[PDB]
Amino acid sequence: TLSAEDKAAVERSKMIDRNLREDGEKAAREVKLLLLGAGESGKNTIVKQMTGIVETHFTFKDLHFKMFDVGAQRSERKKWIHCFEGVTAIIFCVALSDYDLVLNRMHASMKLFDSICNNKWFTDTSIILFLNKKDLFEEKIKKSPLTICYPEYAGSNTYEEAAAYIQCQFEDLNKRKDTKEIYTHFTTKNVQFVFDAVTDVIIKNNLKDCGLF
Amino acid sequence: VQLVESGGGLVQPGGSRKLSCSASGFAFSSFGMHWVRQAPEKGLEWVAYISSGSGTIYYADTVKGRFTISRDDPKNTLFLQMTSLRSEDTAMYYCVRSIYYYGSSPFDFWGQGTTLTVSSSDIVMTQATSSVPVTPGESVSISCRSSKSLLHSNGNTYLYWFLQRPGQSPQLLIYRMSNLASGVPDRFSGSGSGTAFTLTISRLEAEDVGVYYCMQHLEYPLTFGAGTKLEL
Amino acid sequence: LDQLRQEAEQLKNQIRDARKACADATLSQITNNIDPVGRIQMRTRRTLRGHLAKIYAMHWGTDSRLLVSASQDGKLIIWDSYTTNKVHAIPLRSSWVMTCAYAPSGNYVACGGLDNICSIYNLKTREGNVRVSRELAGHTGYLSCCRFLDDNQIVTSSGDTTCALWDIETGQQTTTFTGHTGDVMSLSLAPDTRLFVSGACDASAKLWDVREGMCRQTFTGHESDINAICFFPNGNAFATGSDDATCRLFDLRADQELMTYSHDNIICGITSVSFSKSGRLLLAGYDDFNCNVWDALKADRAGVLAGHDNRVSCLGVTDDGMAVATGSWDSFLKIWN
Amino acid sequence: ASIAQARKLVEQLKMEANIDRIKVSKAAADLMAYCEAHAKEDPLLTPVPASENPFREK
Amino acid sequence: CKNWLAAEAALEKYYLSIFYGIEFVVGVLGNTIVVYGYIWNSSNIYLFNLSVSDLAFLCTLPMLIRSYANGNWIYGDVLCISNRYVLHANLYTSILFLTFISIDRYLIIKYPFREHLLQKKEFAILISLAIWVLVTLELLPILPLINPVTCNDFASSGDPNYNLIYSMCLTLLGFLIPLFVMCFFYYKIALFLKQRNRQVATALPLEKPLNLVIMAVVIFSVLFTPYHVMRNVRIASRLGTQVVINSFYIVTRPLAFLNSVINPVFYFLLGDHFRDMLMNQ
Secondary structure (H helix, E strand, O other): OOHHHHHHHHHHHHHHHHHHHHHHHHHHOEEEEEEEEEOOOOOHHHHHHHOOEEEEEEOOEEEEEEEEOOOOOOOOOOHHHHHHHHOOOEEEEEEEOOOOOOOOOOHHHHHHHHHHHHOHHHOEEEEEEEOOOHHHHHHHHHHHHHOOOOOOOOOOOHHHHHHHHHHHHHHOOOOOOOOOOEEEEOHHHHHHHHHHHHHHHHHHHHHOOOOOE | OOEEEEEEEEEEEOEEEEEEEEEOOOOOHHOOEEEEEEEEOOEEEEEEEEEEOOOOOEEEOOOOOEEEEEOOOOOOOOEEEEEEOOOOOOEEEEEEOOOOOOOOOOOOEEOEEEEEEEEOOOOEOOOOEEEOOOOOOOEEEOOOEEEEOOOOOOEEEEEEEEEEEOOOOOEEEEEOOOOOOOOOOOEEEEEEEEEEEEEEOOOOOOOOOOOOEEEOOOOOOEEEEEOEEEEE | HHHHHHHHHHHHHHHHHHHHHOOOHHHHHHHOOOOOOEEEOOOEEEEEEOOOOOOOEEOOOOOOOOEEEEOOOEEEEEEEEEOOOOEEEOOOOOOOOOEEEEEOOOOOOEEEOOOOOOEEOOOOOOOOOEEEEEEEEOOOOEEEEEEOOOOOOEEEEEEEOEEEEEOOOOEEEEEOOOOOOOOOOEEEEEOOOEEEEEEEOOOOEEEEOOOOOEEEEEOOOOOOEEEEEEOOOOEEEEEEEEEEOOOEEEEEEEEEEEEEEEEEEEEEEEEEEHHHHOOEEEEEEEOOOEEEEEEOOOOEEEEEEEOOOOOEEEEEEEOOOEEEEOOOOOEEEEEEE | OOOOOOOHHHHHHHHHHOOOOOOHHHHHHHHOOOOOOOHHHHHOOOOOOOOOOOOOOO | HHHHHHHHHHHHHHHHHHHHHHHHHHHHHHHHHHHHHHHHOOOHHHHHHHHHHHHHHHHOOOHHHHHHHHOOOOOOHHHHHHHHHHHHHHHHHHHHHHHHHHHHHHHHHHHOOOOHHOOHHHHHHHHHHHHHHHHHHHHHOOOOOOOOOOOOOOOOOOOOOHHHHHHHHHHHHHHHHHHHHHHHHHHHHHHHHHHOOOOEEEEEOOOOHHHHHHHHHHHHHHHHHHHHHHHHHHHHOOOHHHHHHHHHHHHHHHHHHHHHHHHHHHHHHHHHHHHHHHHOO
């Protein structure tokens, strides 16, 4: 019923289909990560260890990682954040030097984390929480008490306690703890932690799929 | 875009030989390729076809089984293995690229071809007028006919027009009986109907001199016309 | 500036008064005289498979046969809608595409997205492969829409609150259109190509003159972001889709809203809108996975196109009005008739 | 201060208000006339026979 | 002597009847609901095939229940052969699908993105058809054994020598080899889960998967080993105490059939993701 050139066009279409499915298989086995964090959260140094969206591709222990730094997008997240609903995990960077450094930046970081974590698009998507600049924090805690940012903090102004306080304060913003996890980390150790967290996410997703989780 | 065929020479009857064509300046892997022969004093004749991706291969009944066509996409080279060479196989062989998708232009580029000499049903296309004296500036018309109607159910009339100027390979003018090929002056016009077609030149230039061939692309045993000569 | 702000309020009141003065009658009262359209029962004639991600944009070629679709798997596919054959599959350098366009001549397609770049592709290359002919950079926000004017002129709206007219030959933006206070999400080009209308997240739509780079009129009335915008086939009116779950019809010459298309069961936002060839229908896509056909003159929900398993992100009606294509986040385009 | 923005807002509002207007009744009449004239030219409004449909789906 | 002769008949009379009745009701309910939940990937294909096999197995119980209640086969010889053959074939098909479920669960742990070819959908469907056909083919030898003359059971029908040989070969091919394959692959899965329990100390542990993987092997082994052992000894005893062996085999048979009931629960409901989907469906 088809013409000769119609049959040739059909053959071309089937070749295109084959290439499309090969590319889809190639993309399915790649890890997609969304990198977030307000202002000088240290992400500019996180990206180094591994004009709009900046995609960074790296491989570590035989996993292909795609990392999407969308921090340069000075636009409404509401209109494009859904583009990323499907990333394996979200990396969130927080600078622990922001207790008293005003725009008090840590409150803005908490607001951004609350928005991202409880977003309807990221109900299952887990969060890797990087707590950067622990070093400068270890000195700033001595000169400036943590009560400057959290007046209700009753613990001692020591690194070991203040760091844990910040960690739990960030992790309690999760309003869907029954479905989502947060992997907190104080910053190859960093890329190793990313690898561990994403491996755990992948394994748990697979186990859920096969009925073991 | 360039196609350079190689391997021509003199072969004794009953021998075997391999022709080659090196592609350059275009995505060879995505084009279908044809071999078209031309005897030293006769018109064109389609030899074989290999589809893009090598999934489909066709041969003319005169060579089917004796010739085999193959392509090396990484090398961007097209081949024609030939065996049992007969005297009828003496002809200039051309390599032709043809890409098939909605709105494409098959047979849009021809290589220069290699001469091969050997020591001593199908749709019929008719070009009754073999020669036509012409003068520059005058309107001219080439006529053609086919046994079957080339108009297909899907509305396409699969007729192609080629011009082979002296000392050159054929050049595509019209594809599917009405579409002017790229780089062709608007002087040429493709008209016709079911089983009867004509090519017209308005205000003919001196460069529009040569043999005009017609070809069908409805049934894959592709057939050419006898050709019409224009002389100044 | 205080006295200037008072003057601005005075001008707002003056324009409101003028629009009210010309608001003698409502479109519904005028349309009461004509009969409703019968239940518009369309069905899926084709299903275009091959995209492996969420389809974000599609566009018809002027021949009413070929259409390009953009998906976030990093591919532009050009389909032969009659046969469902894929003509081309263009791999994108940035997979975050959010818009695509088809040149009226059919020689080029364009696309853009979070990369803030509009890339033009040459379909009719002598080499037989589609390659980027240029990349239009200069926007500081994501590319939300783009529409060809000629083979050489393209207008693009961006999330940086501005639209720009470009000279593809040189790559410079000939004109920059400013005035929106929020991301410009959609852009519709007039039939005469001398005007285009844009809708932004500030819940307003503005009418621009391409050659003079001038904002002629501003239209408001939506309670939320305008996600989609389309010109009425006459070019004297346009319709906007919004997040507040209502479509609205605006008239250029009357300079105000004509009619609003809403229904109680519709509580979600509108992703895309499109008219039919005559303009009697208004097809709109919704987040609830189905497309609603609206009697453009009576605002009655004339039909429904429920065949998608996810959000209907884009619509398109052929230039001859023969069919409707609806892409969706389920990664399928469907031709309805 | 945003005096430039204020002045541009005032100018744009002035220019927007100056344009002449037509009655919404006339606009609605024009839209209805356009729809009436081109009604039979609309395959989606008035489906064509299966023979004239390019998307026959066999 | 007389005590056993009198007592052990009461088992076949009432005990099998009631056990097969309760198994029928709950297994049919569970298999129906899980089938509804399923209706795709290799794992889902295997699980759906397992549910189908269990349901079709359970469908063959009512005739046995009615016959045991009556003490006679009311439905004739043709239905005798059909019912018994379908029962046994669907039992061993379920066993093979459990083995391939374990294989697929190991593969998804070794190849998280489903790279391996065995995890392709069409390959899974091919394997499902192969399992069905192969089980039918290796069950075919049962037909000469279960020819009436009374409707005796598979264990107590036919020539005891050929019956014993076929029963032992069927055990080896359809239970022990699948059992060993399943134990091997679930041992690998358990090692993987225990080694990768907590790479980050604050993550939720993998205790529940490990527990489910252990419980699958435990349930399969406990429920199936006694039935096969007792069937083999019962068949052997017919060669040159017998009623005691018959009673023991009688008690094991419902235990082995109980897999058709547990499998929907275990493989769809104890999986929180599946159960959450089932409610939402």
